[PDB]
């Protein structure tokens, strides 16, 4: 996971609705939910920072040549498909298909899904056509078998092995790439990590909304009923209890969101490190870029996340 949904929750509309007397009573508590609004806005900005740090690592937008002949290796499952009206690779389309008021607002992300797909396409094209050079300066073109010979030399295997088994290695690579799509399509629990974030945020919002029907000791959970049934000197007593309960519920929601945002930021920093090391280069770190000796990585965008295809 890279980012989560950006939610903005308003004080005066949630705690008090459109009640002026309730707002006048809420002014006595100070600036509690100026702090709450500020914290939620900060989380919202941090989500866009996470997405920018993960995907926006390359400057130029590289493109694959129109004639796609890479010496037996074919990347049709990860390159963008122009036939679809989304410019997504088939695996990205499968990933995007697998994942499923009261003052609450959802701010759209700064980078749309199509723009994230463009970033992923740029990274894939750079990796295919220039190896690891484009991540450390100018993009220097290199034949793909020669690049795989360099990557074979980078794990202690002489480069003549790749040249003497080029078509076998290409066949193995293609078969594994196809099995990735088959495994993702046939297993509904493959994308559990992203679904956990989605479910947690949805559950938190649902509980926050359902807290609006709690009496909190008041005669009624509806503020309009209290206003329509009582005069000020008695209605303020009930409104005080409602304000206390709703304010503490909102504070609980904000604290949970802060902790979960710290979780998501840690995961996004890890994803950015993996994109810098596993994708833009070859990593000697053990088990950092998949089981076995790392050869290369291919990024794929997912709704609120990133999927790495570690070729080892």
């Amino acid at each position: 996971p890279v980012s989560m949904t950006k939610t903005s929750v308003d004080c005066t509309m949630y705690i008090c609705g459109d009640s002026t007397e309730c707002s006048n009573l809420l002014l006595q508590y100070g600036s509690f939910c100026t702090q709450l609004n500020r914290a939620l806005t900060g989380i919202a900005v941090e989500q866009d920072k996470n997405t920018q740090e993960v995907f926006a690592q390359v400057k130029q937008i590289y493109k694959t040549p129109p004639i796609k002949d890479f010496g037996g290796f074919n990347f049709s499952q990860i390159l963008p498909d122009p036939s679809k009206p989304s410019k997504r690779s088939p695996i990205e389309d499968l990933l995007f298909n697998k994942v499923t008021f009261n003052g609450l607002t959802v701010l759209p992300p700064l980078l749309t899904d199509e723009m994230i797909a463009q970033y992923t396409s740029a990274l894939l094209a750079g990796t295919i056509t220039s190896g690891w050079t484009f991540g450390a300066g100018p993009a220097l073109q290199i034949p793909f078998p020669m690049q795989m010979a360099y990557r074979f030399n980078g794990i202690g295997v002489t480069q003549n092995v790749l040249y003497e088994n080029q078509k076998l290695i290409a066949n193995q690579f293609n078969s594994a790439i196809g099995k990735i799509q088959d495994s993702l399509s046939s297993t509904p629990s493959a994308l559990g990590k992203l679904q956990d974030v989605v479910n947690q945020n949805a559950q938190a919002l649902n509980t926050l909304v359902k807290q609006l029907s709690s009496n909190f000791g008041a005669i009624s959970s509806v503020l309009n009923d209290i206003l329509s049934r009582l005069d000020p000197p008695e209605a303020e007593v009930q409104i005080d209890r409602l304000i206390t309960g709703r304010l503490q519920s909102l504070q609980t929601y904000v604290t949970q969101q802060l902790i979960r945002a710290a979780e998501i930021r840690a995961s996004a920093n890890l994803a950015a490190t993996k994109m810098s090391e596993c994708v833009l280069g070859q990593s000697k770190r053990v088990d950092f870029c998949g089981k076995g000796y790392h050869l290369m990585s291919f990024p794929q965008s997912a709704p609120h996340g990133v999927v790495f295809l570690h070729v080892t």
């Binding site: 970033y119 220097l140 290199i142």
Partner: protein, 73 residues
């Protein structure tokens, strides 16, 4: 004048065909900047680049630069 975006609508900014680096994030790929008025555009991810690839072509640097950058933590 009046422009309709995905993140609501923006009043007081002129919508253009051009694309520049994001200055003030608006949302859903829309950004705003001051040129002399306020313009709203679709942010550009970077300069277009297409490296010439063939099975037998390689590019090798012949010269170098030593670059020093700062990182603050």
């Amino acid at each position: 004048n009046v422009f309709q975006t995905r993140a609501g609508c923006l009043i007081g900014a002129e919508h253009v065909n051009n694309s520049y680096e994001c200055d003030i994030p608006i949302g859903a790929g829309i950004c705003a900047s001051y040129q002399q008025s306020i313009i709203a555009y679709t942010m550009s991810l970077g300069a277009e680049n297409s490296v010439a690839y063939s099975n037998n072509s390689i590019a090798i640097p012949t010269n170098f630069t030593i670059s020093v950058t700062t990182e603050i933590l």
